Write a protein that binds this ligand. Structure first.
Ligand SMILES: [Hg+2]
Ligand SMILES: [Zn+2]
Length: 258
């Protein structure tokens, strides 16, 4: 029926409705740190989130998205391997049922507890919908989360989850600062890829940060209390909403560091 992460509608079934699932630049991928090419020409990343405007948080049935006002250049990403300005439209997470899994990208086969995706679209294309029709239409910042100390800047998100337990529910979520989720260093790996959930469009320039942020056991625990299902339906815990690593094929992963 509709895609999901269960045994009957999970990642291994996606190709039937979305043939691109077996494409040439699918994500996520395993990052082999020993064959990644240090590219000294890669410029530093420029994250300008000081004027970001969060608007709402929403349980969409596969994750929860925090949406931002992208009608103007308020929170943008540029620099790095990018040409042009990309606007932040939303961020979400992928997590596991256990601390030993949850991330989509892996480093030398290592899986993290979760992975944060900050989705941006290339402004030269006018809107998000037009951006998804271009090979350089999107830029996604991937940040790994490991279990340890609590992340202060993440608590506001955790506290509001109670209000959006089921699919379709949303809540106002203004004045949230995404800078509170960034690690200290901006060193990264980058390769050409795709969205990790259907439609799985190959329009993404992935920028995966080398340094993960840490969150407490109690913080990721609240993520696991969300439901894939809508209100009044049989409860299905929202856990393991991640896609397995895909073949790298004819692609080179470049590192901004050495
Ligand atoms: Hg595309
Ligand atoms: Zn994602």
């Amino acid at each position: 029926h509709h895609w999901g992460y269960g045994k009957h509608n999970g990642p291994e079934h996606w190709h039937k409705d979305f043939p691109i699932a077996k494409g040439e630049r699918q994500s996520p991928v395993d990052i082999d740190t020993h064959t990644a090419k240090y590219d000294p020409s890669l410029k530093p990343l420029s994250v300008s989130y000081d004027q970001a405007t969060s608007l709402r948080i929403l349980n969409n049935g596969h994750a929860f998205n925090v949406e931002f006002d992208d009608s103007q250049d308020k929170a943008v990403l540029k620099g790095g391997p990018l040409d042009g300005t990309y606007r932040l439209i939303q961020f979400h997470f992928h997590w596991g049922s256990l601390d030993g899994q949850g991330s989509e990208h892996t480093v030398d086969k290592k899986k993290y507890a979760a992975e944060l995706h900050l989705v941006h679209w290339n402004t030269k294309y006018g809107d998000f919908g037009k951006a998804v029709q271009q090979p350089d239409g999107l830029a996604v910042l991937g940040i790994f989360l490991k279990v340890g100390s609590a992340k202060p800047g993440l608590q506001k998100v955790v506290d509001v989850l109670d209000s959006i337990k089921t699919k379709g529910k949303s809540a106002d979520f203004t004045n949230f600062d995404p800078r509170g989720l960034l690690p200290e260093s901006l060193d990264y790996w980058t390769y050409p890829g795709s969205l990790t959930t259907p439609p799985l469009l190959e329009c993404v320039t992935w920028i995966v940060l080398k340094e993960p942020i840490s969150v407490s056991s109690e913080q990721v625990l609240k993520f696991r209390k969300l439901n894939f299902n809508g209100e009044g339906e049989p409860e299905e815990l929202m856990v393991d909403n991640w896609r397995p690593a895909q073949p790298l094929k004819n692609r080179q992963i470049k590192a901004s560091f050495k």
